[PDB]
């Protein structure tokens, strides 16, 4: 069991039962912060690179380009370093010095874009770089690359099945690209045949999945639950396997993450708090009393989630 490089050490994250949430221990969390790069994205960063290698789109010498400096960019940076690929990430010049130093420390060629243009500027710049030499650059496109939900169907989902001896009844997961809930749900429902309840979680401030499914006018909005609530329906969110959608507000997601730290000794990010808050709400409904609810905690926090942070 010696991994050839750090990209192969992804997953096999632990399930921990919560003591101060749920009803009679019916809430169990899957800690994705226990991963390389400290988040669930290590899985998709690894698999999008591996799949691009297998299908020939990524060869020795071509370079990776993207516009994410969030968990996916960090994940791609680690995988690129671990497998020997050059990688350029665009990002608004207003990003933190800490995030910049982290990406540079990983070997990333960081291209800073105009602060005033925000993520639109960085995305446009990444597209510009690829367009300049399409045969040299590869943009993996996390919101639509099938290798994203596929790695969750092959690893994350089976891990939940295995660690719960097939007893999982409900899976609760915040939606960013939608890969986690999609891949996990396909694994458990289609590959293992159990008709569980799949619950997507989104910010009440940008409830686009809820609005969409209700046939209401789609109105995205700003929120502080980093990692989820992209403001649109990504191609990697398989709405057909979603049974329920729970909304959670930013303040509650924050308070919940803080409680996980102080009351359970679990160091998770704000989106983990959002997922647990949604899961706790369902766990205290009589209908879910005898059901095992597994909640994905997407990332870890190495710091207390201060107001400055949120």
């Amino acid at each position: 069991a010696i991994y050839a490089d750090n990209s192969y050490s992804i997953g096999n994250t632990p399930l921990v039962r919560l003591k101060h949430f749920g009803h009679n221990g019916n809430v169990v969390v899957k800690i994705e912060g226990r991963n390389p790069s400290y988040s669930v994205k290590c899985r998709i960063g690894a698999n999008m690179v591996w799949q691009a290698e297998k299908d020939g789109t990524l060869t020795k010498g071509k370079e990776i380009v993207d516009a994410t400096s969030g968990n996916t960019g960090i994940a791609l940076a680690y995988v690129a370093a671990a497998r020997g690929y050059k990688i350029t990430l665009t990002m608004p010049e207003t990003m933190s010095l800490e995030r910049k130093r982290l990406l540079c420390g990983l070997g990333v060629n960081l291209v800073l874009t105009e602060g005033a243009k925000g993520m639109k500027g960085a995305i446009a710049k990444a597209e510009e770089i690829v367009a300049s030499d399409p045969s040299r650059y590869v943009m993996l496109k996390q919101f639509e690359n099938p290798a994203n939900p596929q790695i969750h169907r092959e690893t994350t989902g089976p891990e939940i099945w295995k660690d719960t001896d097939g007893k999982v009844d409900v899976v609760v997961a915040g939606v960013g690209t939608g890969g986690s809930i999609t891949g996990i749900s396909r694994a458990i429902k289609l590959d293992f045949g159990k008709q569980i309840t799949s619950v997507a979680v989104e910010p009440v401030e940008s409830p686009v999945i809820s609005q969409t499914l209700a046939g209401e006018e789609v109105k995205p909005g700003p929120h502080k639950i980093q990692g989820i609530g992209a403001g649109f329906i990504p191609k990697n969110l398989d709405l057909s396997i979603i049974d329920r959608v729970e909304t959670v507000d930013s303040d509650t997601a924050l308070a919940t993450a803080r409680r996980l730290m102080a009351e359970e000794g679990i160091l998770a990010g704000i989106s983990s708090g959002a997922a647990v808050a949604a899961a706790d709400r369902l766990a205290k409904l009589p209908e879910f009393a005898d059901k095992l609810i597994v909640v994905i905690l997407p990332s870890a926090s190495e710091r207390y989630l201060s107001t400055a942070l949120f």
């Binding site: 994410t68 969030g70 960013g176 929120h223």
Partner: peptide, 4 residues
């Protein structure tokens, strides 16, 4: 919120 695309900076995921």
């Amino acid at each position: 919120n695309l900076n995921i």
